[PDB]
Structures are given as C-alpha cells and as structure tokens.
C-alpha cells in the first residue's frame, strides 16, 4: 500500500495473507467470506508470464494478522487449502479480466475479535455504492513504494473513478468486470495498492445497514501510485453468479 497508514487492531478482520511455504514469503492478500471460503485474485495463483502456477500444497492462508513478518501467537490462525478454484474465463493473456479465485479451507476457521468474514454485495448494495466519488478501503502488506515493506497491515481509503477517466488513463482494454480507484493528479491526496497487495479486498461500509461489503479485489496497475494512473479492481458483484455456483457445487 502506497501513502497509507497502519491499520488499527481488528480494523480489517476479514484480511487474509496468502503465504508461500518455501521460500517463506508473502504472496498476496485475500479475504475471508465464510468459515471455509477465502476470496483472492486469480493472478495470485496462476500467472504464466511470471511462471506462477501454485497448487494447494504450496500455500498457507494466515488469518487474523496484523504484523507482516511476525508469527502472531494466540491471534493469527494458519489454515491449509483443500482446493483452489480459478474463474474459467480468467484472462491472464491480455488485461487480467475476471481476476478472481476461491480457496476452500481444509478445516473451518474459528471466528474471534481478529477473524470475521466480510459481506458480499447483492445487486442493490452494488448499484447504490459502486459510484464515482464514493470511497472504498484497500488493505494489504504489499510494497510501500513502486521502486520498502511495512511492519504492519496498511490501510488506504480511495475514491471510485468514472469509467471514461479509467479508460482514458491507459492503453489497456478495461472491461465491465473491472472498476478503477484512486485520486486524480488535481485532487492533492494520493494512495494506491502495490505489488503484494493483490487479492486483498476493496471494501465499503454500507450507510444503510452499517455492514462492510467487499466490492472489489486488488488486481492491477501500471506501477504504484503514479500520477494520472489508477488502481484496477475485480468487480465482485459482476462475478457473484460464479462465486455462488462454486460455493453451491463444492459445499460451504
């Protein structure tokens, strides 16, 4: 996270760390959506340009964390993966279209003060909140700068950007399965996600029922926090039919 701040304790209890077993390192972010299901970006698991193709046994999910590198004894919970499900129409070749994956845990995670699921939006919440100017929150343990690494979970609040402004900022083709966020060079404020924050959630607090909803998944950007560039997020609601299909077919 670039131009963010340290998260408060229990501020993002759905935040999940995707952790590589060997060498021991942070791979990505992810989010807890039930006691058995974790949501992340498909590119965190499969990205052939970088020779990335992780299998279940290669990874651990660490839930309830705050410190990036420390083992947070009696707080964090470490879970093993039962199965990885990548969107069948995930487009790693061009623009990371449908950058979404689900991970089913071997055992259910016990909820606590530091571990709690985020909601998934329904059509009404998405239509009400996914609007230009409305701000969401991005969290992660990723790089602090494009060209170092934080001691604890970082947080940044960022405004959703108008689709024409998103499209005009880049040469990449932007799809309806993406939305973009960040400040315009003229706004004065800064911030973005960066490498290592992918798979993490873009959340919004509904002013109707006071619950936190995961509207986006940290996906891609041209660098980190560049003027005139924006961060791109997977549109969770647009891919909810796939989410529900996977959960309905492979059990909750």
């Amino acid at each position: 996270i670039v131009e963010g701040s340290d998260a408060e304790i229990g501020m993002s209890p759905w935040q999940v760390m995707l952790f590589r077993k060997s060498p021991q390192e942070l791979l990505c972010g992810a989010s807890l959506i039930s006691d058995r299901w974790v949501l992340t970006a498909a590119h965190c698991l499969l990205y052939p340009p970088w020779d990335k193709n992780f299998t279940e046994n290669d990874l651990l999910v660490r839930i309830g964390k705050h410190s990036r590198t420390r083992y947070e004894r009696n707080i964090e919970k470490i879970s093993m993966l039962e199965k990885i499900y990548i969107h069948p129409r995930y487009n790693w070749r061009e623009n990371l279209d449908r950058d979404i994956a689900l991970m089913k845990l071997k055992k259910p995670v016990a909820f606590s003060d530091y571990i709690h699921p985020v909601c998934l939006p329904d059509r009404e919440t998405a239509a009400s909140l996914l609007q230009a100017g409305y701000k969401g929150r991005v969290t992660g343990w990723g790089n602090l700068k494009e060209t170092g690494q934080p001691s604890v979970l970082q947080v940044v609040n960022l405004p959703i950007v108008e689709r024409p402004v998103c499209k005009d900022s880049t040469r990449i083709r932007i799809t309806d399965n993406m939305f973009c966020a960040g400040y315009k060079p003229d706004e004065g404020k800064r911030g973005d996600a960066c490498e290592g924050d992918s798979g993490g959630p873009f959340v919004m607090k509904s002013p109707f029922n006071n619950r936190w909803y995961q509207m986006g998944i940290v996906s891609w950007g041209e660098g980190c926090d560049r003027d005139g560039k924006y961060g791109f997020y997977t549109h969770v609601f647009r891919l909810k039919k796939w989410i529900q299909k996977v959960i309905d077919q492979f059990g909750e």
Partner: peptide, 11 residues
Amino acid sequence: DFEEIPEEYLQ
C-alpha cells in the same frame, strides 16, 4: 525476513 511458524502447518 519472516519469523518461523510452527511445524504442524508446514507438513
């Protein structure tokens, strides 16, 4: 850079 984790999860 990462503090070691219990072996029960690494196996």
